[PDB]
Each structure stands twice: as structure tokens, then as C-alpha cells.
Design a protein around this ligand. Structure first.
Ligand SMILES: Cc1cc2nc3c(=O)[nH]c(=O)nc-3n(C[C@H](O)[C@H](O)[C@H](O)COP(=O)(O)OP(=O)(O)OC[C@H]3O[C@@H](n4cnc5c(N)ncnc54)[C@H](O)[C@@H]3O)c2cc1C
Ligand SMILES: NC(=O)C1=CN([C@@H]2O[C@H](COP(=O)(O)OP(=O)(O)OC[C@H]3O[C@@H](n4cnc5c(N)ncnc54)[C@H](OP(=O)(O)O)[C@@H]3O)[C@@H](O)[C@H]2O)C=CC1
Ligand SMILES: NCCC[C@H](N)C(=O)O
Length: 413
């Protein structure tokens, strides 16, 4: 038994897809599909779901609405089905506590229980060759019990999210419970402290406020290479870059202009914090000046040069620019809120390397391939270079999903 499509992850990108495929199914027939996710109980970045994490995107830019507001899967319908719509309204906000967005996604997901396989991590994809042409694809995933699984599919779409970014100096410490990436924040905090946070982004700010608010025992240092925290920029003219119309424009630009646009707009999303959050962090420090009790430290300008483990704690050599001084501090724990990297060919797609072309991902999000390769491989979130800032986000999923299902059906038929 061969599957028309299989996807890697049933995160948002892939769910949005599932819905589109379902919408097309009535007109064009229903493909047999599966989406595997490595989470037994799926939470959307669960380890990051702290008390006051606000969706950084308008709820209207949910899974279906930009394409089809009349879908049963809109955030609003979800709210209605949970008898919460009126109440949400009295809220007057556009940005739901991310815990809520999570429920929505889980709820939407429950509607595809047949297509979703959870608890299965995909390890690699192998070509199945008949006559030197890749007719089908082999997907190898390992479940929670440790049992590997092999399935065969006509088409593949990979939407696994990103992998955490570890600065070099910390790579030495892989495996020390004492140091952990933000992404894994809830698991590790469940095990009087000094903790350090590395990075000046949202993930960094969110860790800090959470520690301050939830852990009185804790004193936190935010170590920033950058001078300050810069505000995420969401103004309307600017926000127009997360538009569906923009994907077209950016795609058609020469490589030089694309990067320019990406540089000019980096601040929409990366290394920036929400305006309200900065104040609140700013307020916290201000209060220290008042109280005179210096619990926390804002080490802007600081670069970690040496990090080493110890019986005592973790030793960091911090270079503070503008002082030029190098000083040593030791922390009970360190938190890396250094972000994510989405690099497309991991060990996961290696087996196909031979068939993947030089030219960039397709406008339709299909990787270009050899004439040898007859299957179709698609990716979501790995085309930021060519598809814009919207790519790694929730911004165009509704649209992107239509395009992809459109190709997939066209490929299949
Ligand atoms: C903490 C955090 C908050 C964010 N908040 C927002 C926001 O408010 N608004 C916004 O627009 N964007 C936000 N983003 C950006 C985010 O990338 C998108 O919102 C969205 O998560 C992208 O969806 P995705 O399905 O493509 O990837 P993901 O949501 O990361 O889905 C990938 C899923 O597949 C699993 N997986 C990974 N590898 C494999 C594999 N080997 N095999 C099987 N499963 C695998 C993962 O565990 C995960 O469940 C946020 C990102 C983070 C990290
Ligand atoms: N919806 C929500 O409430 C949340 C949304 N987010 C989203 O997740 C995505 C990524 O989040 P986040 O990781 O915070 O943002 P970024 O990945 O953009 O931020 C990374 C931070 O780490 C620093 N950094 C990276 N490498 C090093 C290094 N080698 N040495 C020192 N510092 C380093 C960067 O500093 P520098 O700028 O100087 O390079 C930067 O401040 C974004 O889309 C963000 O909006 C994150 C958390 C919650
Ligand atoms: N970091 C999320 C940015 C979302 C973007 N401002 C949008 O409106 O799509």
C-alpha cells in the first residue's frame, strides 16, 4: 500500500495543508495521506507555553481564513464551538494567549485523526527506484516504543519546524542538564538560583519575564551582545511584507534584492521583542533602581567567550564591550534563547541528495529534481530566502496550502 502523500510533522504548516486537501477532495477526489509527528501528545511548542505568551500574529491569520473564511476551522468557528466567542470578544484583543492557540490547533487536528500519526519521528526518506527513476519514497520513522516504521508514498512534504541554534561556545555542553535551549524550557525548569539567558529576542524576553514572575527564588541575567532590545515592528505599511501578494514579488526579485529586502525587514521578526514586553522588562529593571535590590542583571553588550561546566555551576567569561573588560560569572543554570535554524537538507533527506537540484525551491514549494525523480517533494518553512519572511510564520499558511495541494493534485493527476 502506497500513499499519495506523507508529511513530516503535523504542526501548523501541515495541518493547514490537510484542510486544503480536504477542501479539494470533493471536486477532485481524496488522496490517501498521512502526517507523522514526533509528539505523542501534540502541543504547539509546548515547552514554551508560559503564562503571558501572546500570539504574535493576528488571530485572523489563522489556519484557513485568508483562503476561506467560511471554513469550519477558522479560529472564530473554533471559539463558537467552544461557546467562547462572545467572551473572546469582550476581550478586545487580536492576540490570543498562545495556550489558546494551541487548543485551537489541537482541535482542528482532531478532525484529521485518520490522517495523523503521532508519536512517530521521521528518520530518513529513501528513494524507491524502478529503472533508475525514483517512483516512490520510503519513509522511515521510529515510534515512541522504539519500533521503526516504513511506509511508502507517492509524494512527500516536509514541514518539521526548525532546529535550535546553539552558539559554538556552548556546543561543548551538549547533554548537561544545567544548560538547555529555550525550546525545551518547561521540561528543564521542572528540574535559590542564578540562571542566565543568552539572546535578545522574544524567546529571550519571554524567558526572563517568566522567570521573574514565576520563580522568585531565581535571579536572572540577560546577556545581550546587542546593546538593547529592539521592538518587533508590526506597522501596517511594513506588515505588508507578510502579505500573500508579497510572496510573488519577492520571488521574482534577483537574489541581491531578496536579501536586501530580508535585511531591511529582519526586524519584523528576528532579534526583536514585542513592544509591550520591552516596557515590562524595562519596568522591572527600573524597579530595581527604586528598590535598590538588584536581583536581575541586564548585561547588554556582553559576549560569552568561554563556557565550562563545574561542580559549582557553569562558568562563563563575559566580555563587555565598551568596557572592554572580561569578567567571570558562574550560574546555576543557563538558558539559550538563541533561536532556530531552518536548514533544509539534514540527515533526513540525504538519500535524495543525488536527485535534488541546484535551483531553489519552486514557487509552488516543490523542490526541483532530476528527470529521474518522478515523485514530488515539497517543503514548508525552508524557503525564507526565496519566499519571504512569511515563510517561517503563520502568515500565509492558508494560501500556501492551497498552492501546494494544487500542485500535488496536479502532480498526482
Ligand atoms: C515559541 C515560538 C512561538 C512562535 N509564535 C509564533 C506566532 O505567535 N505567530 C507566528 O506567525 N509564528 C510564530 N512562530 C513561528 C512558527 O514557526 C510558526 O508559527 C509555526 O510553528 C510554523 O509551523 P510548522 O508546522 O511549519 O512548524 P512547527 O510548528 O514547528 O511544526 C513541526 C512539528 O513537527 C515535529 N517534527 C520536527 N521534526 C520532525 C520529524 N523528524 N519527524 C516528525 N515530526 C517532526 C515538531 O515536534 C513539531 O511538532 C513561533 C515559533 C516559536 C518557536
Ligand atoms: N508567539 C510568541 O509569543 C513567541 C514568538 N517567538 C517567535 O519565534 C521565532 C524565533 O524566536 P527567538 O529565538 O526569540 O528569535 P531569534 O531567533 O530571532 O533571536 C535569537 C537571539 O539570540 C541571539 N543569538 C544567536 N546566536 C548567538 C550567539 N552565537 N551568541 C550570542 N547571542 C546569539 C540573537 O542576538 P543577535 O540579534 O545579536 O544576533 C538574538 O537576540 C520568532 O519568529 C519569534 O517571533 C518566540 C517566542 C514566543
Ligand atoms: N513574528 C510574527 C510576525 C507576524 C506578522 N507581523 C504578521 O502580521 O503576519
Amino acid at each position: 500500500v502506497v500513499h499519495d502523500l506523507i508529511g513530516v510533522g503535523f504542526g501548523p504548516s501541515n495541518i493547514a495543508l490537510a484542510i486544503a486537501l480536504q477542501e479539494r477532495a470533493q471536486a477532485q477526489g481524496a488522496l490517501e495521506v498521512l502526517f507523522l509527528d514526533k509528539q505523542g501528545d501534540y502541543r504547539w511548542h509546548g515547552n514554551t507555553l508560559v503564562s503571558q505568551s501572546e500570539l504574535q500574529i493576528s488571530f485572523l491569520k489563522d489556519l484557513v481564513s485568508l483562503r476561506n473564511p467560511t471554513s469550519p476551522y477558522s479560529f472564530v468557528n473554533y471559539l463558537h464551538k467552544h461557546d467562547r466567542l462572545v467572551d473572546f470578544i469582550n476581550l478586545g484583543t487580536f492576540y490570543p494567549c498562545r495556550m489558546e492557540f494551541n487548543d485551537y490547533l489541537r482541535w482542528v487536528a482532531s478532525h484529521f485523526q485518520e490522517q495523523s500519526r503521532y508519536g512517530e519521528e521521521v528518520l530518513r526518506i529513501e528513494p524507491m527506484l524502478s529503472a533508475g527513476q525514483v517512483e516512490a519514497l520510503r519513509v522511515i520513522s521510529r515510534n515512541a516504543d522504539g519500533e521503526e516504521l516504513v511506509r511508502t508514498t507517492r509524494a512527500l512534504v516536509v514541514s518539521p519546524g526548525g532546529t535550535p541554534r546553539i552558539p559554538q561556545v556552548f556546543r561543548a555542553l551538549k547533554g548537561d542538564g544545567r544548560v538547555f535551549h529555550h525550546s525545551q524550557y518547561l521540561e528543564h525548569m521542572a528540574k535559590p538560583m542564578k540562571i542566565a539567558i543568552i539572546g535578545g529576542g522574544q524567546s529571550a524576553a519571554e524567558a526572563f519575564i517568566d522567570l521573574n514572575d514565576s520563580y522568585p527564588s531565581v535571579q536572572a541575567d540577560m546577556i545581550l551582545r546587542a546593546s538593547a532590545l529592539k521592538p518587533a515592528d508590526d506597522s501596517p505599511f511594513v506588515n505588508e511584507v507578510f502579505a500573500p501578494k508579497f510572496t510573488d514579488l519577492i520571488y521574482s526579485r534577483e537574489h541581491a534584492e531578496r536579501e536586501r529586502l530580508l535585511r531591511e525587514y529582519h526586524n519584523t521578526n528576528y532579534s526583536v521583542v514585542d513592544t509591550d514586553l520591552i516596557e515590562r522588562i524595562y519596568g522591572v529593571f527600573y524597579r530595581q533602581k527604586v528598590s535598590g535590590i538588584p536581583r536581575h542583571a541586564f548585561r547588554c553588550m556582553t559576549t560569552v567567550e568561554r563556557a565550562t561546566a563545574t561542580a559549582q555551576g557553569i562558568e562563563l567569561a563575559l566580555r563587555d564591550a565598551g568596557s572592554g573588560e572580561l569578567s567571570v560569572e558562574t550560574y546555576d543554570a543557563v538558558i539559550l534563547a538563541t533561536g532556530y535554524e531552518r536548514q533544509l537538507h539534514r540527515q533526513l533527506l540525504e538519500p535524495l541528495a543525488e536527485y535534488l537540484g541546484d535551483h531553489e525551491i519552486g514557487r509552488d514549494y516543490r523542490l526541483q529534481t532530476d528527470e529521474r525523480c518522478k515523485v514530488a517533494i515539497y517543503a514548508q518553512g525552508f524557503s525564507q530566502a526565496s519566499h519571504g519572511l512569511s515563510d517561517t510564520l503563520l502568515s500565509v499558511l492558508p494560501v500556501r496550502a492551497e498552492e501546494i495541494s494544487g500542485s500535488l493534485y496536479q502532480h498526482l493527476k
